[PDB]
From Swiss-Prot:
It is an enzyme of class 3 (hydrolase). Its EC number is 3.4.23.22. It comes from Cryphonectria parasitica (Chestnut blight fungus). Belongs to the peptidase A1 family. It catalyses: Hydrolysis of proteins with specificity similar to that of pepsin A, prefers hydrophobic residues at P1 and P1', but does not cleave 14-Ala-|-Leu-15 in the B chain of insulin or Z-Glu-Tyr. Clots milk. Residues 17-328 form the Peptidase A1 domain. This is Endothiapepsin. Keywords: Aspartyl protease, Disulfide bond, Hydrolase, Protease, Signal, Zymogen. The active site is at D35, S199. The gene is EAPA. Disulfide bonds join C255-C290. It comes from the Eukaryota. One of its GO terms (molecular function) is aspartic-type endopeptidase activity.
Length: 330
């Protein structure tokens, strides 16, 4: 089997991408944030504290004839700075573009943190990291991809995110018309539960490519590109007036600037992120100071190849017995 679904930016800045997902019988369609950096499929629901729902579409398990409460099971995900989302667990039928998994664990939120309430465009998350990170207790549950894997024509999914435009998630096949040239595959460490790999280096604009190993994760659930401070300084040095601001919490640059591209290495191949992808707009409405899309990973503990990087590429998440990651230009 295979499935395909269009993923769409939630706003004019590509702050995140939502993909429609059918849950239950009859289907309830929720717009989920497909997240290769986490491993829980969790949703706003009829059980979510009423004052914490503000425009989101909810899953109502009592209206699904295939929903079954997973007895005694709970989940909780904590955020590095902001509270937590948590709840109970059902099993139900989940389909993405008709690709169907029966008995998928669907984590129903009883509480969500404030940032989720405040974002009416995201009805929940569909995790696509490795199932070792799934938070359900006392019985860990499998991701949608893990449950689908054996049925798929190939045990793979691909991310083709758009800049200011819709994109595609495909499961089970490689659309060879979606990229240019060849796909370069690179090794993955699954020990931390992420799609963790090593970039071979970087270049700023038309400058010299610097060969240096950059370990990090391919994370569709993170907006920006987080890299070591030396790399980030080399990039912003090329933007007149750009500087790291402690109060804002990262690099800002004059909105009038024209940003250079940024190139990252995958083996001997090169992925070029156009400068326009690095502009995240005014720090506050009406400001002429803009927020950069490449930021230091210093406080994070890991480098993150988030949407700013991934949307420049066609990305293959190969879940074969030894997983690998593929990148092609597009």
């Amino acid at each position: 089997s295979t499935g395909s679904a269009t993923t769409t930016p939630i706003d004019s800045l590509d702050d995140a991408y939502i993909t429609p997902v059918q849950i239950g019988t009859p289907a309830q369609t929720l717009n989920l944030d497909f997240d290769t950096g986490s491993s829980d499929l969790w949703v706003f629901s009829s059980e979510t504290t009423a004052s914490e729902v503000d425009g989101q579409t909810i899953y109502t398990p009592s209206k699904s004839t295939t929903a079954k409460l997973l007895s005694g099971a709970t989940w909780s995900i904590s955020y590095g700075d902001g509270s937590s989302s948590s709840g109970d667990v059902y099993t139900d039928t989940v389909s993405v573009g008709g690709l169907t998994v029966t008995g998928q664990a669907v984590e129903s939120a009883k509480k969500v943190s404030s940032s989720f309430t405040e974002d009416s465009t995201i009805d929940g998350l569909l995790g696509l990291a490795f199932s070792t990170l799934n938070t359900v207790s006392p019985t860990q549950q499998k991701t949608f991809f893990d449950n689908a894997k054996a049925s798929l024509d190939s045990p793979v999914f691909t991310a083709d995110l758009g800049y200011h435009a819709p994109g595609t998630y495909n499961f089970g096949f490689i659309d060879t018309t979606a990229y240019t040239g060849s796909i370069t595959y690179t090794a993955v460490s699954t020990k931390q539960g992420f799609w963790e790999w090593t970039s071979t280096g970087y270049a700023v604009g038309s400058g010299t490519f610097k060969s240096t190993s950059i370990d990090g994760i391919a994370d569709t659930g993170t907006t920006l590109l987080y890299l070591p401070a030396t790399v980030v300084s080399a990039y912003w040095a090329q933007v007149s007036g750009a500087k790291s601001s402690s109060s804002v919490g990262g690099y800002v640059f004059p909105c009038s600037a024209t940003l250079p591209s940024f190139t990252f290495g995958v083996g001997s191949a090169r992925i070029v992120i156009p400068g326009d992808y690095i502009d995240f707009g005014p720090i506050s409405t009406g400001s002429s100071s803009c927020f950069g899309g490449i930021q230091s990973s210093a406080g994070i503990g890991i480098n993150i190849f988030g949407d700013v990087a991934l949307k420049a590429a066609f990305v293959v998440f190969n879940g074969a017995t030894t997983p690998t990651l593929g990148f092609a230009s597009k």
